Amino acid sequence: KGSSKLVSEFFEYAVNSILFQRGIYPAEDFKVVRKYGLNMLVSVDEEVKTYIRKIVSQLHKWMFAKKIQKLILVITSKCSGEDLERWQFNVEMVDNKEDELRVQKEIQALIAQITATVTFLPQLEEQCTFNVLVYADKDSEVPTDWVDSDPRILRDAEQVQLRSFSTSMHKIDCQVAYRV
Amino acid sequence: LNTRVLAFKLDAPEAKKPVDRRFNTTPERVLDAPGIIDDYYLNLLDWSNLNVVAVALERNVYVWNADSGSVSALAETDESTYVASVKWSHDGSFLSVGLGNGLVDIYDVESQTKLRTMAGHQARVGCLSWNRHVLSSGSRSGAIHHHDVRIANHQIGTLQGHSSEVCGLAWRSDGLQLASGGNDNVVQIWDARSSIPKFTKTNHNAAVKAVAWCPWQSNLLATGGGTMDKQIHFWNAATGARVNTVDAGSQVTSLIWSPHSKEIMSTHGFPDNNLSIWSYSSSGLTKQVDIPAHDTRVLYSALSPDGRILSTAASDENLKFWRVYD
Amino acid sequence: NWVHMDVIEQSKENIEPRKAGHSASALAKSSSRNHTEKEVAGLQKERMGHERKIETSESLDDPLQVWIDYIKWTLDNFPQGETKTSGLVTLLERCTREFVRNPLYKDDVRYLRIWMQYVNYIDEPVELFSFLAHHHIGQESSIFYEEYANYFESRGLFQKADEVYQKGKRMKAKPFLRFQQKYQQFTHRWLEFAPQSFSSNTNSVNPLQTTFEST
User: Fold this and answer.
1) What own/partner pairs with CB < 8 Å and gap ≥ 24 does B58-63 have?
2) In sequence order, what are the residues at sequence separation of 6 or more whose Cβ sits closer than 8 angstroms to the Cβ of residue C83?
3) Which of A115, B68, B185, C54 is the most exposed place for a label (fewest CB within 10 A)?
4) Do A148 and B19 touch (CB under 8 A)?
């Protein structure tokens, strides 16, 4: 309900952020908008906006139905065709007016950490593309635009656990795997 | 396994090609500093008003008299720990030594005997600032402790203004205000009587190790940020206004106001390892002098009590002396 | 097996910005350093081990590996890079010097990468690039041309950078796709930042040139 909406929106902003920070599209293809008390980068490109929108709309449906366990974003060199980086958002069911504010602060902190990953992440020196995966319940409804895939887990990867935020409904955290 | 893995079938859009005063560069003197630790979170150098340099090498504090050039080994910690900070009291009589284990030692410089050890920090004490007989200690826990060094129960108060390591700490020379910077990228400005921050500044995007009060203007404070920040901001500590700013180009490890001229010196870490002297005015800051000081980050610095000479130290194991004024 | 970002943040101001990034576990170890004589001794032991491996390295089919492991160990254990006790630059120097005349590594991109890490510490990099070219090291690789050309471009010498790119194109340095994109992008930057010096035909417009006369 409220939580699925909130979380889906977070996914939209996070995906944009990763795309900008990892240099998947050039800086000029984004603009600054104020969200979570931060300056967030968000695509101004109609094609990219539409791609992301389709994705996020489906994610919102799966959140509402409680079908989605994880959202995955993998980054891949167009040169070698191999996966260099894997961002994994874990969705778990948790076991007032103030709560909305708290959630906003927690999200802020997670986004700041996502940005701070720039301190240790290898520079991507080749143009990369990206793919998005979700882990879902077996009984989930799958639209034509989504299809079976292996998890594309990284081999010989470093992995970092980021912070989480919780609504009254969902606990969301982020992990990043990468190859040095 | 209840999990089904799905991938969005459509290929992501391919990216489109985008449309859019001469300064001596040679130090006057160089002193070997074997075993000096390379860590941004420590402060291992200080120069007293009695003209004594204290420097921490691993477990030991050595003192050098700038007049006589006599060297002596003032302190050696237990093997389970190391020196994280040294600070002289204002009169230069006492040396406070913060340790990696949270203890704070106080030594008498005359007899070189440890006067006392002060516990109560739960982790490394990386920064120290003296207000009269009050010594203030910052820690990796984010806590600040006020110690009245004359009394058996030393701690007279605590401030918790930081959610991670306290990096910079400085009392104003008149003791009315204290500034703290932190690894949480926060600057706190505290009135002496209050455990409530007078102002809290979030402008820095990295740790703030470098904190300095202007000696010719009471309320003027300089702070400078670490690697992801690189900025030096200036504040009016009465109104909370940001009155100046400059892009330093490198991680800022220290800021030292020139007592004799309207200028401020900064030392730097990644990438530049340099020493900069800036002219200060209401209109703004102009870079006067920029010179590579060390072969590694210039992590530690202290100004001579006559304000004419700046000592810097680094993990190239040189303690260097630069004549900055005259 | 999962390093928390809080732990990394504790050490963030000791992390040298590096193109190749940092190992997570290495950062975990950095944040927990106790700076004791014992810890230093452990590091001294491991260093000794690596040095012994360099001793016996000749027997191995791919001895460069031994240096890589050693270089990594340094990068991993000293997130701030060069210090007296880290000896990073010296190690990079010994490694670059070791394989100069070795045919097996002429075109090996690992060795070249080690050279590129070394060049960051060099006062006059142009001598280094010239050195490599003279010894036919990395000449088939896009990374060499990228770094050489980059030095020139940073210096603002766009024409010099282009010459390097031209050699690479003749060289057919690989992977040729990466090289192609890199060259293209450079050209773009040259046209944006220093158009007046662009020496190649632009098929530029000629306002009011006569394209037809009735007579």
Assistant:
1) B58/B82, B58/B83, B58/C35, B58/C37, B59/B83, B59/C37, B61/B86, B61/B95, B61/B97, B61/B107, B63/B95, B63/B109
2) B38, B296, B315, B316
3) B68
4) no
Calculated CA dihedral for residues B252, B211, B33, B25, nearest 10 degrees: 60
Task: Measure the CA–CA gap between B134 and B150, rounded to whole angstroms.
Answer: 8
Please state the length of chain B.
326
Question: Cβ of C214: how many Cβ atoms within 10 Å?
Answer: 3
Q: Determine the CATH number of domain B1-326.
A: 2.130.10.10
B227·C37 Cβ contact <8 A: no
Strands annotated E in chain A: 30-35, 38-43, 68-77, 83-93, 128-137, 146-148, 158-166, 170-178
- Per the structure, the complete domain to which residue C85 belongs is given by 1-215
CATH number of the structural domain spanning residue A99: 3.30.900.10
CATH of residue C126's domain is 1.25.40.430
Domain count, chain C: 1
- Position of tokens 């930042």? C193
**8 Å CB contact of A25 and B4:** no
* Residue A29 DSSP symbol: G
Phi, psi at B237, each rounded to 5°: -80, -10
Q: Is C69 helix (H, G, I), strand (E, B) or coil?
A: helix
> A159 CA to chain C: closest CA distance, Å?
6
DSSP string over B160-176: E--SS-EEEEEE-TTSS
- The neighbours of chain B, by the rule of 3 or more Cβ pairs under 8 Å, are A, C
Q: For residue A19, how many other CB atoms are within 10 A of its CB?
A: 23
The tokens describing C109, both together, are 């991109």
Resolution (A): 2.3
Structure tokens given for B61: 């504090």
Best residue of C12, C13, C77 to probe chain B, by most B CBs closer than 10 Å? C13
